[PDB]
């Protein structure tokens, strides 16, 4: 039996104001997540622009998430991934010592480690701390794939590695994982297919869409865990169009644009190489947003 | 719309000395019927459509119809082609010879546009008045029937009622049923039968059911009964055989497994298909042991 | 090892009122001959092999043979099929009716293994005594003839002399000619004709040459003369027309282009192939204005 | 100005976890003595991801100082997926004597074409040395489209070409048919000759770490339009060129260097590690077909 972080989770956006992390806005957005039934938040994942933050800013967002969730049931699953194991270890230890409840750790991007290397990477991380570690597979961004064999071996050799966030659009893989290792927590990292992953025994989502519609994502997720599949599928079907349009340009470009258009953040700011969407996609995002009910603060 | 749904088997076609073993074909079909299968699909990809002549294709349809005649089991006849005149000819034969419906694969090799796909299927649909199921398998055809095309055909042609999806794309299944929840989405990919049914799919056209018809039919009927727990359990237990049956191109592994089970007399294909590599042969034999294979 | 190499044209098949326009077919071939082409390829992918009947296919081969008879232009007949018995039949017909060699596409749709591909081509190569050229186009067929398999066939079969590559994989072309520099590698991809030739390829089987036979054959011969500057220059100039001819699936744009140029009477295909969109019709027409197109 | 010809994506040797600086210098001298035109410190092959910014800076200084009294140029690895980090590296390389920079497309965060354009524009405007774009979609999860490369070439004076490692010869044709003024550089050893025969003007090689004499000969034969001799060497090199990617680069090349006695220890920084026993033997077998120059 392992310690786990599951349920509806939000891959938090990181709002910028004048190039700087807007810390008060960050906390406010987290409280809005908490108030709308979210079970955990993920500071500084892909959606949080982990690549363009400094290590110090990355750490600051984690503290803000811990502090804001303190005295609530909401857990902090801190973004702690890196393509350098020594950097990933550093983030894990910080997350550990500053009260994060677990870490999300993306597969190394760019340097394309072998399955053996991925094993050693995660093993080194998992042994550096005693908090839950969620693996994170997203081959379209990293250029590598953590195989099912490798994921299962890590779950079985490391006590704190408890599951994987899958963003590979491969439901066959999801069946493979849970058929051979039914003990692991399979987490959806692809909004459009939240329901199918939950209906196969997935235990949560780490969502982009929940930044905008946290009430609907947590409802979907909780319906599924309660085996009310008709209601979970209904929301998933409703959410399909926005779930897709939030990726008309690379995430987090559309979600931030949507949060801006909704009046949830003050400034539509990115750090290069990320930038505003074309005026066309701006209109498309405005188009889909208007078809949903968006919570305020 | 009239439909054919539930648990269906994409029947293998047994050869003896290069010729279609008619008696064995009929016996294999009776075995499917006795194990609670709802429909059989003669001459699909699994039935080696490519290497049968038009005469043998027609004969296989006839045996299927006649074998299922006095039963509740329906015949969804394999009727696709990459040439529209051939496909229409097949469709009209199937209609006139007692098939309950037709399965019609997307044209392979010639890569039609979406407009061409539309006209292809519209031509087929207007040639018969029995249900037509579309069939998407881009990994084999080199073309994809898009979601929009599928939906237009479903809405424009009364007898077109759904699609067999073999694309390994659960996102598309969600896309399909969220925009047109009236269509019958049929699983053409055994390993993910359950996920497709749990999103509102209404049946399977299965390779694995040639070997394990009772388990595939049970899986499907649990799902249709909203007993997802039982359906998922079976889908998980079947994952090993489901995948190993595609260690080489279908239907190489399934015919190999049917042979190892003693269900067919000879492991015979028509070129360019041939028996599997000996490594894969052993993998198939080892996996089969985990399962209980019904006899005749 | 007898070979057919140089500048070759994958001939379009003109239709008039649903039928093969045989007079127009012969006229287009004579145009090819008169513009420096070394060989024509009747009924390949470009020739809509999939929608022709076997009788129509055989007719087109005979017309090409007859038209080329008294010239030095060779007929490399399209004789491919996804069914080995069909491909053997086409191969034998081609030999018996005066074809100089055969092109034989890899089996589409049924995805045979490398072992299956070996036996498929070995059967074909042993059925006749004329040169056989292999044809790799994985985007259309869904299978790939591995370098190892191509090389075995080249070494095991006397009359198999090379491959037409339409895979966009220059790495593979390096692999082939590094390990077997005796085989004839043929470009089946116009846009990269020059890079394939400059690595030691000995010809092309072209779509573009239907419209611009003089430029393609000049390119090829410049390359064979090791005048690489001149070959690359033509290749770069042709890049735009080479790409626009694939804005929709081949041969939809090439036939549209021939119609625009006044080279065929009607813009007819056979379903599932159809007319291009007005937009793509305009793109092709726009691009065509940059090039000198040979008359009748 | 431009930096072209035969170039080497330098491996970075480690000893006891630390960059072996003396070994790094000897390896560069060895490249210089074997006819190489330029070296590329800290590219993908040099484990850019796992070096700290400080160590990355040190490797650049060593390359510049080692090359200083020679004709060999230093094209400094200066890429990043964060534009601010990339501008920092670019400025450092300029200020510390680099002749130009190599800048890989942002990895992981997948910028749009507009973002890639602004990324490189910000970099190009920060220094007045040549910049070579670097496209490797299989590693970065994004591609610099032909249009974007061409706009950057045309809009930015010091952006002069692209290292292409995308296994797409159609792209190479596209690029040079529309903009033949750019320096297309091969970043894929197996197809060095095809890229050069199409108007490419150099290579940035993995294989040249082990066999610099052969890579520089191939490149110079090609540049002198002796395609016969260039293809001959490209063909001879095919086995080693492929085997050096039997596992992710630079895992096989470092293994090869170690087996050859060109580096002291087979040491990577996680998440990179030693190859499987099976691939270790394969690499060892292929190496026996080639003559490896010493120091
Ligand atoms: N189901 C029985 C018929 C099999 C026919 C065929 N082997 C070939 C189909 C064909 N359209 C025939 C063209 C023959 C003339 N070139 C094709 O090969 O594309 C196929 O459909 O795979
Ligand atoms: N004035 C010169 C006549 C040359 C004849 C022919 N066109 C071939 C004609 C041929 N296809 C040959 C068939 C024999 C193949 N070994 C034919 O006679 O039909 C050629 O070889 O180029
Ligand atoms: N979340 C805060 C840290 C961000 C760091 C970095 N931008 C780059 C990481 C790095 N390993 C740094 C290498 C520096 C020396 N070249 C990389 O660029 O790969 C990333 O991980 O995306
Ligand atoms: N005695 C003649 C040697 C020439 C020096 C240098 N190695 C490079 C020079 C440089 N790297 C600085 C060049 C600045 C580039 N814009 C150096 O001074 O070390 C070269 O030009 O090749």
CA C123 to ligand 4 centroid distance, Å: 65
Token duo for residue B293:
């294979």
**D37, D39, D67, D93: residue to mutate for ligand 4 pocket, most atoms within 8 A of CB:** D67
CATH superfamily of domain region D1-295 = Aldolase class I (3.20.20.70)
The count of other CB atoms within 10 Å of the CB of residue C282 is 11
Distance CA C222, CA B272 (A): 39
Write out the H or E segment, with its range, that includes residue D160.
strand D159-164
Answer whether C65 contacts ligand 2 (Cβ < 6 A): yes
CATH 3.20.20.70 assigned to B1-296: yes
Estimate to the nearest angstrom the gap between the alpha carbon of A108 and the chain centroid: 16
Q: In chain C, where are the structural domains located?
A: 1-296
Using DSSP bridges, classify how beta strands B15-16 and B19-20 pair: parallel, antiparallel or unpaired. Answer: antiparallel
Cα–Cα distance for residue pair B10/B208, rounded to 1 Å = 9
Q: What are C183's two structure tokens?
A: 């085989």
CA distances in angstroms from B83 to A195, B87, C270, listed in the order given: 39, 6, 8
Distance from the Cα of B201 to chain A's closest Cα (Å) equals 12
B175 interfaces chain A, CB cutoff of 8 Å: yes
Strands D131-135 and D159-164: parallel
Distances (CA, A) of C128 to C5, C80, C91: 19, 14, 7
CA–CA dist A107, A143 (Å, integer)? 9
Q: Ligand 2 center to residue C100 CA distance, Å?
A: 7
Q: Quote the CA–CA distance of A243 and B131 in Å, as a whole number.
A: 33
CATH topology (fold) of A1-297:
TIM Barrel (3.20.20)
CA distances for A25 relative to A16, A78, A266, angstroms: 9, 18, 8
- Number of the ligand 3 atom closest to the C-alpha atom of A111: 19
Q: Where do we find the tokens 């090819």?
A: C32
C-alpha C212: how far from its chain's center? 14
Tokens read off for B197: 């049914």
Is D204 known as a binding-site position? Answer: yes
Query: Residue whose CA is closest, atom 15 of ligand 1?
Result: C54
DSSP-assigned letter for residue B49: G
Q: Are B243 and B284 in contact (CB under 8 A)?
A: no
C199 vs D199: CB contact, 8 Å cut-off? no
- The answer to whether the beta carbons of residues B78 and B103 sit under 8 Å apart is yes
D2 near D161, Cβ under 8 Å? yes
Q: For chains A and B, count residue pairs whose Cβ atoms are closer than 8 Å.
A: 70
Nearest bound ligand to the CA of residue C55: 1
For the Cβ of D94 lying below 6 angstroms from any atom of ligand 4, the answer is: no
3-class DSSP string for chain C: CCCCCEEEEECCCCEECCEECHHHHHHHHHHHHHCCCCEEECCCCCCCCCCCCHHHHHHHHHHHHHHHCCCCCEEEEECCCCCHHHHHHHHHHHHHCCCCEEEEECCCCCCCCHHHHHHHHHHHHHHCCCCEEEEECHHHHCCCCCHHHHHHHHHHCCCEEEEEECCCCHHHHHHHHHHCCCCEEEECCHHHHHHHHHCCCCEEEECHHHCCHHHHHHHHHHHHCCCHHHHHHHHHHCHHHHHHCCCCCCCHHHHHHHHHCCCCCCCCCCCCCCCCCHHHHHHHHHHHCCCCCCCC
Interface test with C, best of B109, B143, B274, B277 (most C CBs within 10 A): B109
B46 and B250 in contact (C-beta within 8 Å)?
A: yes
Q: Which atom of ligand 4 is nearest to the CA of D99?
A: 15
Q: Does A200 touch chain B (CB under 8 A)?
A: yes
Distances (CA, A) of D212 to A40, A164, D40: 54, 43, 13
Q: Best mutation site among B49, B80, B120 for ligand 1, i.e. most ligand atoms within 8 A of its Cβ? A: B49
Instruction: Tell me B8's DSSP state.
Output: E
Task: Answer whether A1 touches D (CB < 8 Å).
Answer: no
Q: Could D109 and A84 be called an inter-chain contact, meaning their C-beta atoms sit closer than 8 Å? A: no
Q: Out of D107, D249, D270, whose CB is closest to A124?
A: D270
C33 lines ligand 2 (CB under 6 A): no
**Closest Cα partner for A46 from A206, A203, A163, A174?**
A206
Structure tokens at A164: 């994987």
How far is the alpha carbon of D71 from chain A, nearest alpha carbon, in Å? 31
Chain A contact set for B181 (CB, 8 A): 237
- Look up tokens 């800013």; give the residue: A57
Q: Are C6 and C38 in contact (CB under 8 A)?
A: yes
Within 10 angstroms of residue A180's Cβ, the number of other Cβ atoms is: 15
Chains A and B are touching, with contact defined as 3 or more CB–CB pairs separated by less than 8 Å:
yes
Q: Indicate if ligand 3 lies below 6 Å from the C-beta of D48.
A: yes
Q: Which residues of chain B from 214 to 243 reach within 8 Å of chain A, CB to CB?
A: 226, 228, 232, 235-237, 239, 243
The method of structure determination was X-ray
Between vectors from CA A181 to CA A180 and to CA A186, what angle results, nearest 5°? 120
Q: Is C208 in the pocket of ligand 1 (CB under 6 A)?
A: no
C220 is written with which tokens?
A: 């090829």
Q: Which residues contact D265 (CB under 8 A, 6 or more apart)?
A: D13, D14, D15, D258
The reply to whether ligand 4 has any atom less than 6 angstroms from the CB of D226 is no
Closest CA to D191 of C146, C196, C136: C196
DSSP for D25-60, please give it.
Answer: HHHHHHHHHTT-SEEETTSTTTTTTTS-HHHHHHHH
Cβ of C295 closer than 6 Å to ligand 2, yes or no, is no
Q: How far apart are CA B265 and CA A176, in angstroms?
A: 33
Query: Which amino acids of C are annotated as binding site for pyruvate, given as ranges?
Result: 46, 205
> What are B92's two structure tokens?
């009209």
Closest C-alpha to A222, from A209, A205, A243, A240: A205
Residue nearest to atom 10 of ligand 4 (CA): D97
How far apart (Å, rounded) are the C-alpha atoms in residues B118 and C272? 8
Selected residue of B47, B144, B267, B271 to mutate for chain C interface (largest C Cβ count, 10 A): B271
CA gap B86, A115 in Å, rounded: 48
CA distances (Å), origin A203, targets A140, A169, A178, A182, B196:
23, 17, 11, 11, 18
State the catalytic residues of A: 136, 165
Cα–Cα distance measured from residue B198 to residue B202, given in angstroms and rounded to the nearest whole number: 9
- Say if ligand 2 is within 6 A of residue C77 CB: no
Ligand 1: distance of its center to the CA of C166 in Å? 21
C248 in contact with ligand 2, CB cutoff 6 A: no
User: Quick one: CA torsion of C189, C194, C198, C203, rounded to 10 degrees?
Assistant: 60
How many angstroms separate the alpha carbon of residue A79 from the centre of ligand 3? Answer: 14
Q: Within an 8 Å CB–CB cutoff, is residue C191 touching chain D?
A: yes
For residue C128, the distance in angstroms to the closest alpha carbon of chain B comes to 18
Question: Quick check: D46 and D10 in contact, CB under 8 A?
Answer: yes
Known catalytic residue at D163 = yes
Cβ atoms of D9 and D46 within 8 Å: the answer is yes
Distance CA D212, CA C295 (A): 53
Pinpoint the alpha helices (H) of chain B.
22-34, 54-68, 84-96, 114-125, 138-141, 147-156, 170-179, 193-198, 213-224, 228-237, 239-244, 252-261, 278-288
| For ligand 2, atom 17: residue with the closest CA | C98
Kindly report the number of other CB atoms within 10 A of residue C241's CB atom: 23
Pocket mutation for ligand 1, best pick of C11, C13, C20, C49 (most atoms within 8 Å of C-beta): C49
Would you give the distance in Å from CA A291 to the centre of its chain? 24
Residue identified by tokens 């070096």 is D51
Q: Enumerate the β-bridge partners of residue D19.
A: D14
The 3-state DSSP class for residue A41 equals strand
Closest CA to B8 of B72, B95, B88, B54: B72
Atom of ligand 2 nearest to the CA of C68: 7
Which subunits have 3 or more CB–CB pairs within 8 Å of chain D? A, C
Structure tokens belonging to residue B94: 């199937």
- Out of C164, C172, C202, C232, the active site residue is C164
Which residues does chain B have within 8 Å of residue C113's beta carbon, measured at their own beta carbons?
A: 248-249, 252, 274, 276-277
Q: Chain A contact for D177, CB < 8 A?
A: no
- List all residues of chain B from 49 to 78 with a beta carbon under 8 Å from chain C: 50-51
- Find the catalytic residue in D24, D120, D134, D160: D134
d(CA D203, CA D189): 8
- State the pairing for strand pair D18-19/D14-15: antiparallel
Distance from CA of C51 to the nearest CA of B (A): 5
Residues recorded for chain B:
296
Closest residue to A140, CB basis, from D106, D141, D273:
D141
Q: Which residues contact A293 (CB under 8 A, 6 or more apart)?
A: none
| Exposure on the CB side of residue D206, measured as CA atoms within 13 A | 27
Burial letters B277-287, b for 16+ CB under 10 A, else e: eeebbebbeeb
Q: Is the CB of A53 inside a 6 Å radius of any atom of ligand 3?
A: yes
């Amino acid at each position: 039996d392992k310690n786990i972080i599951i349920g509806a989770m939000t891959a938090l956006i990181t709002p910028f104001k004048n190039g700087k992390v807007d810390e008060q806005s960050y906390a406010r957005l987290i409280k809005r997540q908490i108030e709308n039934g979210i079970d955990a938040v993920v500071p500084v994942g892909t959606t949080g622009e982990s690549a363009t933050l400094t290590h110090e800013e990355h750490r600051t967002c984690i503290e803000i998430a811990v502090e804001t969730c303190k005295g609530t049931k909401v857990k902090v699953l801190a973004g702690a991934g890196s393509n350098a194991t020594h950097e990933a270890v550093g983030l894990a230890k910080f997350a550990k010592e500053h009260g994060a409840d677990g870490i999300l750790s993306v597969a190394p991007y760019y340097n394309k480690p072998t399955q053996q290397g991925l094993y050693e990477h995660y093993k080194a991380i998992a042994q550096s701390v005693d908090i839950p570690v969620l693996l994170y597979n997203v081959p379209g961004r990293t250029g590598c794939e953590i195989s099912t064999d490798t994921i299962i071996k890590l779950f079985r050799d490391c006590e704190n590695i408890y599951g994987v966030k899958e963003a590979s659009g491969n439901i066959d893989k999801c069946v493979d994982l849970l058929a051979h290792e039914p003990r692991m927590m399979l987490i959806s990292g692809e909004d459009a297919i939240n329901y199918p992953i939950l209906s196969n025994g997935g235990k949560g989502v780490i969502s982009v869409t929940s930044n905008l519609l946290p009430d609907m994502i947590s409802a979907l997720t909780h319906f599924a865990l309660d085996e009310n599949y008709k209601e979970a599928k209904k929301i998933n079907d409703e959410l399909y169009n926005i779930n897709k349009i939030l990726f008309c340009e690379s995430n987090p470009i559309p979600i931030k644009t949507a949060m801006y258009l909704a009046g949830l953040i003050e400034s539509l700011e990115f750090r290069l190489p990320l930038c505003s969407p074309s005026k066309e996609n701006f209109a498309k995002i405005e188009e889909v947003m208007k078809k949903y009910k968006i919570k305020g603060f």
